[PDB]
Amino acid sequence: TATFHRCAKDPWRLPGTYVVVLKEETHLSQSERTARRLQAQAARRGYLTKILHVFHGLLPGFLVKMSGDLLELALKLPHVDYIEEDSSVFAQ
Amino acid sequence: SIPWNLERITPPRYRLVEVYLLDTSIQSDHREIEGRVMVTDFENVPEEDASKCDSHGTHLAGVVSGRDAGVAKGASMRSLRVLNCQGKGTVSGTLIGLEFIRKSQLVQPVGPLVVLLPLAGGYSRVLNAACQRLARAGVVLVTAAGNFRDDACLYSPASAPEVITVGATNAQDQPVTLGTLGTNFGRCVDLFAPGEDIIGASSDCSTCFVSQSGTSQAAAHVAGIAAMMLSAEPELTLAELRQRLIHFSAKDVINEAWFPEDQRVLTPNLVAALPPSTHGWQLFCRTVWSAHSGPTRMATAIARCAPDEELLSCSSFSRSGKRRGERMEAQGGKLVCRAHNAFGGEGVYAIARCCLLPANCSVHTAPPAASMGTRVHCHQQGHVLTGCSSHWEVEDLQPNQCVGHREASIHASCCHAPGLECKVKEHGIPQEQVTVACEEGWTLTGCSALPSHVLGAYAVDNTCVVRSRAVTAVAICCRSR
Numbered sequence A: 001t002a003t004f005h006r007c008a009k010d011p012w013r014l015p016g017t018y019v020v021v022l023k024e025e026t027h028l029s030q031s032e033r034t035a036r037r038l039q040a041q042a043a044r045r046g047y048l049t050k051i052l053h054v055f056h057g058l059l060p061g062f063l064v065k066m067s068g069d070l071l072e073l074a075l076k077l078p079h080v081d082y083i084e085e086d087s088s089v090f091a092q
Numbered sequence B: 001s002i003p004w005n006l007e008r009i010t011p012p013r014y015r016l017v018e019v020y021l022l023d024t025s026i027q028s029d030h031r032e033i034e035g036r037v038m039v040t041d042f043e044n045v046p047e048e049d050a051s052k053c054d055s056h057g058t059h060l061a062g063v064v065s066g067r068d069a070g071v072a073k074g075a076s077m078r079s080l081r082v083l084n085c086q087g088k089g090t091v092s093g094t095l096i097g098l099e100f101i102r103k104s105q106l107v108q109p110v111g112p113l114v115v116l117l118p119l120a121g122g123y124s125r126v127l128n129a130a131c132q133r134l135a136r137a138g139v140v141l142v143t144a145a146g147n148f149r150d151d152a153c154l155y156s157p158a159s160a161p162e163v164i165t166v167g168a169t170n171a172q173d174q175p176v177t178l179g180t181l182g183t184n185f186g187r188c189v190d191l192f193a194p195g196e197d198i199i200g201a202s203s204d205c206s207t208c209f210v211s212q213s214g215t216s217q218a219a220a221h222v223a224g225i226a227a228m229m230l231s232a233e234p235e236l237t238l239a240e241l242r243q244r245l246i247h248f249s250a251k252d253v254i255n256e257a258w259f260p261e262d263q264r265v266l267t268p269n270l271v272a273a274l275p276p277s278t279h280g281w282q283l284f285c286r287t288v289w290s291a292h293s294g295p296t297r298m299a300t301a302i303a304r305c306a307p308d309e310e311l312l313s314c315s316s317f318s319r320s321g322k323r324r325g326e327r328m329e330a331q332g333g334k335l336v337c338r339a340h341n342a343f344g345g346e347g348v349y350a351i352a353r354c355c356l357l358p359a360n361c362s363v364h365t366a367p368p369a370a371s372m373g374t375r376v377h378c379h380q381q382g383h384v385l386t387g388c389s390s391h392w393e394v395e396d397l398q399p400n401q402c403v404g405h406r407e408a409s410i411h412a413s414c415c416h417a418p419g420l421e422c423k424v425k426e427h428g429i430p431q432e433q434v435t436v437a438c439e440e441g442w443t444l445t446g447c448s449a450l451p452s453h454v455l456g457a458y459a460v461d462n463t464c465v466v467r468s469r470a471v472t473a474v475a476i477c478c479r480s481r
């Protein structure tokens, strides 16, 4: 049921960095456990990952620096609502 | 002596809020803003590939609150850096910035908050969801429509339904267009505001000034207006503030020849202005357009009103005229406006009239009937008819009463509003466009065509527009007693 999204404007995409968005009522403790579970599952497959930030206050989830190869795995993690590849914003 | 843009937002009769800015670094010592801007210097910027670095943010803090060239002179501001020296940021950095604002509020609650987001990226599900969460928490978000001469619905945060999205106009009330760049437009734009040749604080020196252009400058004018409207009336919900910004704007001053043909009608022809006074009850309505249904032979379009607004009418439109009308239907204890496409496509729009009516409304429906056509009425005493809708299944063809074609279902929006007086104004001519307008002081609640082939109908401010390939435009006009 979890889906993946990337920016439609190809030069603005930032592959390698993803915002993992969890289901509405996910507690911060669960977001941290899901980020650690991703890191351990990735390590067992030979992938290095970096949890840059854990979100709470607006939306539950986290920001992860990792190879896109791990996306099918990350989409299977518990509480995952969707995953978005990072993208650029500009002064207007 | 007065910058043109400050005169432009001054209305024809005239006499506690914090503004958060998510932009580049700023020159907090500038005389325009010194002592009134708190630099949090929360930093989340991508690597670059000081007067140049702080140019954008310093000019915008000046547009909002500058002592001499600001909209809301002396307003308190807080700035967060999310854009690098070249004005580039990330969606993730923007999310962290928005989250930091929410955390700051939880730790030290203050009064109403206006968040100015003078930036844009491509449509982002996560950035729009974060704007939604922050608005649901009670914060007002004002965003730049974008400078890409494109539909603002394709950019974020511009496309987030819960924000106020602002387009840019010049001294001639024309959309700003500078080369390959120019203001964004479309149904996701709430209104326009001065966005060309805007004088403001220059970070080159503490007393220096520079003229800049963009939807960022346009959005800073609306953030300044919103901060002042919220200071005078701090209980305003977001829906009440958006309705007031629309109501107090200069109407039909933008030449829409500049926009692509299909975008002209969808784009609000509004230039922001301050209200004539700081502060009985009046009827506020606005038009909400859905996204296009698609090409599908069975395609439908859905238009809904923002939280704490009432849907008073529903119309539909198709450039080809190949449609099966529309219907008002209850969903999650709220009325929605659903429009149906027909065989030959290419799709349709559902157009709702969304009003502030704190009154009990309902839908009265009659299925197809008979030479007398299909009819339904608000039978109950003290009830006002606010809108008529009609839909048909078949591929091809009195006061408080709606009339439809014999092969079509008819829907009536019926409201128990004792403080409201309503009249139905009709205008029929034997023509590609027929219009009928409510008189001054009256608010258009409903717009429809009398049941030869019409493309559709839509309300433009307080004018009902009926487009055809006689033909009668029918307007329902209401006012507070």
Ligand SMILES: COc1cc2c(cc1Oc1ccc(C(=O)O)c(F)c1)[C@@](C)(CC(=O)Nc1nccs1)NCC2
Residues within 6 Å of the ligand: B153, B158, B159, B160, B161, B162, B163, B164, B165, B187, B188, B189, B190, B288, B289, B290, B291, B302, B303, B304, B305, B306, B307
């Ligand atoms: C993606 O669509 C839109 C983006 C923006 C805007 C309007 C949009 O149109 C919509 C939005 C939502 C629905 C729905 O069904 O919930 C709908 F039918 C139409 C406005 C003009 C603000 C506004 O009106 N927001 C609303 N919220 C609720 C109703 S209107 N500026 C910001 C971006």
